[PDB]
């Protein structure tokens, strides 16, 4: 009888939807269809403790920036996603962290930094050490993922739940 409202945020095209669809439906989307805001649910067992995960897949497009206050108010944990092949998305993810903490009026709040598209090994603009450094700056953990090859997809969501449980 436990549930978590998880929210996937980050800049446009970094793979928020591809990660979420791989997690929910176990298939990889090739087309890039920009999201306004989509919702999904999954029943999981994390550390032998069952939990329903209600996932909000949000807009990376600035056009829909005004919807952030609403979803940031109600989110219980956030996956901060950037693409390792897009340095702009890497430099911009801190803006999402700042807005979450401003809406929560808190110095810390459950989050994890995800460097997606790690399968694009020959196209990287951000090294693994750079992502780990940014995570330390933001006081969160770092995980690299690939929606394409389904690397660390379930793990990213499970780990966010673990972080949320430690904040309680
Ligand atoms: N090689 C590779 N491509 C990926 C990966 N994740 C997403 N992509 C791709 O990158 C594009 C955008 O992915 P998408 O999930 O729609 O990104 P998004 O962050 O939801 N975009 P938006 O903010 O506009 O909703 C796609 O064409 C998709 O196939 C990945 O892990 N590896
Ligand atoms: Mg999307």
Author numbering: 12 to 179
The paper states:
Active RAS interaction with p110α, along with phosphorylated receptor tyrosine kinases (RTK) interaction with p85, activates PI3Kα, allowing it to modify its lipid substrate, phosphatidylinositol-4,5-bisphosphate (PIP2), to phosphatidylinositol 3,4,5-trisphosphate (PIP3). Here, we present structures of KRAS, RRAS2, and MRAS bound to the catalytic subunit (p110α) of PI3Kα, elucidating the interaction interfaces and local conformational changes upon complex formation.
To determine if p110α and RAS undergo conformational changes upon complex formation, we conducted comparative structural analyses using the structure of p110α and RAS GTPases in their uncomplexed states.
